[model samples]
Target: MHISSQQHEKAIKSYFDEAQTQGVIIIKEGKNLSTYGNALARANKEYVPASTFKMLNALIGLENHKATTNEIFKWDGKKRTYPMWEKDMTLGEAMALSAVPVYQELARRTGLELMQKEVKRVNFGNTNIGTQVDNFWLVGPLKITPVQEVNFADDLAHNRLPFKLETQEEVKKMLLIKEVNGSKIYAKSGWGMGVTPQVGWLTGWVEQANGKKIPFSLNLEMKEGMSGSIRNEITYKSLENLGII
Candidate 1:
């Protein structure tokens, strides 16, 4: 219901057409809530948080001292979903690489009890973690929509979440995608290829040169051989067109 500008919607739609894909994108700044596609509908629809959950997990882990930015986690040489997963990586490095195995280990250390409490406190989606702490967000009752993701990005960037503000800052640093045009974009992309209808998510905020910040969330159906990379491609294109990047 927050979307209001047809001008913005059309601008956003052009990028989707350029990519030949379908999805929803939400950008919230000042008094504007701009969107494209079935923004209202898809923004309300819940799907797996995927790698985007790493931002939250990092916060939770840092707060509880389960994960530290500099602590290195070992790689057991077991095969992984990604080639990047093969290297031993620190918590920060794991985040940068979007490595799943390391975070899954962090999940066990965080455990189900505290994880459940933290998730509910954060009010993420259905607040469901089930029994599989290691894979809940990867496969599950754990879900979030585009609208909630944008809000999460907003709150996280603003340090408005209930966690320690310093912890929030640390997590925000972990979400960094890149810096461009005197602005820094912080975000993460998630892939749900395990599901029948593969879904991809990209969520985070941008710190503009003028010091103003904007939060955005984008998700689209995985197609064209279904790489998670499309999530950021479309998002960055939309942001560029909207003059946010």
Candidate 2:
């Protein structure tokens, strides 16, 4: 059974109070699962995976030899309004920045056939690609829950996913944000704005100095004036208060 940690509840609610929105946070360590704010009832509710799917996309790209860590993706010379996405980037850089264009290019290279196959084989989300090749996770029928996101991150950390161990390690390295106080924090932040009631995601885990990995995932309804930055703000703060950072 999962313990409803008031510490986590308080930490999560503090952020939700400021954002004026509702969300869920799920954290797992070994046999224990702790959740806050939104409860188990709705924590399993499905939401778009958004940029969180980029990590999986990176795995597929590496596993299939479609992309490499340092291989540069040349800018298509198209306009992208998002910050840091107008320029070209390597697979890791693109994944770190959550650049849509580069990953979309990867999706194009992987194409519809293999994308569907890998999504199923990996058992991610609903495995629903709809009929489109590239935008299902961004705009449509593919969805995952907070619980699934945490579980996926946990698997990636432990190398329990079906992909090659090297593939998972490489992608995990790509997700690294920083190392502080003898521990490394790896994360991927995702925003899904293509549909109504937009959502934001922060899904990943923190590896402690003691070699314990705490994987967590958070998603909230993107309020009209809320910055995507709030996703990290809430997540990091919760982890900080929990003494994981």
Candidate 3:
């Protein structure tokens, strides 16, 4: 879990030069290689998990039988920032859209005790569910660092978390970004609107057809007026430059 400084220095700088923001990208393949760029220690600093937590929320909802992939979460009928979020959506749809309201409902139904139990079971982040049940992962109290983020993702990819194998598989399918060059990439991105300079995250793993897997996490400050796509853009570029994807 340490950076291969000599190997990653140039690539990390390339990411920093192109990203033009403060952030860190950490990538791990098998047990032997771990590389990172920019402020490696920052990877351990906690930040709100934001929409990236949706992946966990979806798993919790499914595991507890609070909802099903096919179950519909009716729209509140209020105008939303995103057009795609204005209509009723199933669990899968909500997850794909990063629909906040739908997850809020799931969190409400999940209750504090069960949510705390699950979060603890997985040893996620600071393990602080805070006082606000629905908003904990959003801004209330829960926080996670990039290092923790990658480790959590790696566990999920390998079915090493406390969740059932089926739960992990379903989540992986829901988060699938694309299959490219014989590699299937499953990831989730988060934008933290509640903080200054904002924050963005992309966490997931790449599973090659041959069975090799690389889990990664990228989190950084989002300067005002910058395109949010930088979260995925930098991650994809870094992975490509590193020859992992």
Candidate 4:
């Protein structure tokens, strides 16, 4: 878990060198690991953090006793659910599934004060969850640049963020994207539909084959909407090339 300064820098640069990123930074073990293009640009530089904030929300919720992994909450007819649909989940399941409504209720329970306090604590710079009624975290207006995301990623990896040990552990348990090969990708995606320019955010860590964790985070904002099919191709390829799976 402790990377030498030289190794850290080397890994960062190597990552950036291979990356086709427009705006991004990759950090490991609390260092300025790697960057490229507009990675450092402050204007084009904010990331929405999207569902990535869910991990943070989950963390704060657990810490403040707002919710627990074992806690089971159901979705009512508030958002118009069909009778046969299966959208119900617990906090753990919601975290795994990235359930928006589940998080909406969680945000509702914790309110903005706790959410804002922990957002600052986690150092997700420029991230805003909006009012509870707005359900910002649930709908994704919280912005953070790729640079900011890498910083957040590093903080989570090294436990530099303000979350308690137990809360952090629970949050980590929920930060993942399951796929084939019995591998896991810890990530969250946020997308905006009608908002000016369409935006997307994907941020999380990747656990390598050797069990040494390599932090990875990205923010892809586009004028037009990004087709999910097109995006998946690139993401899977990157994971393979990185030996992530």
lDDT of each residue in 88-164, candidate 3, tens digit only: 99877787788999999999899889999898888889999977888888774888998889988898899998878
RMSD of 4: 5.9
In candidate 4, what are the lDDT values of residues 25-112, reduced to their tens digit? 3434335354322334532465455556677777778888988788888767565443332467787787655566777788778877
lDDT of each: 0.84, 0.85, 0.84, 0.59
Cand. 3 TM to true fold? 0.93
- Residue 190 CA error for candidate 3 (Å)? 0.6
Clashes of 4: 6
lDDT for 213 in candidate 3 is 81
Please identify model 2 stretches exceeding 4 Å from their true place. 1-8, 38-40
**How far in Å is the alpha carbon of 59 misplaced in model 1?**
0.6
Q: Which ten residues in a row are the worst by lDDT in model 1? A: 31-40
Ranking 2 against 4 by TM-score, winner: 2
Global CA lDDT computed for model 1: 0.84
Candidate 4: where is the Cα deviation over 4 Å? Answer: 1-32, 36-44, 79-86, 127-134, 138-141, 179-184, 222-226, 229-232, 242-245
Which portions of model 1 show Cα errors greater than 4 Å?
Answer: 1-7, 38-40
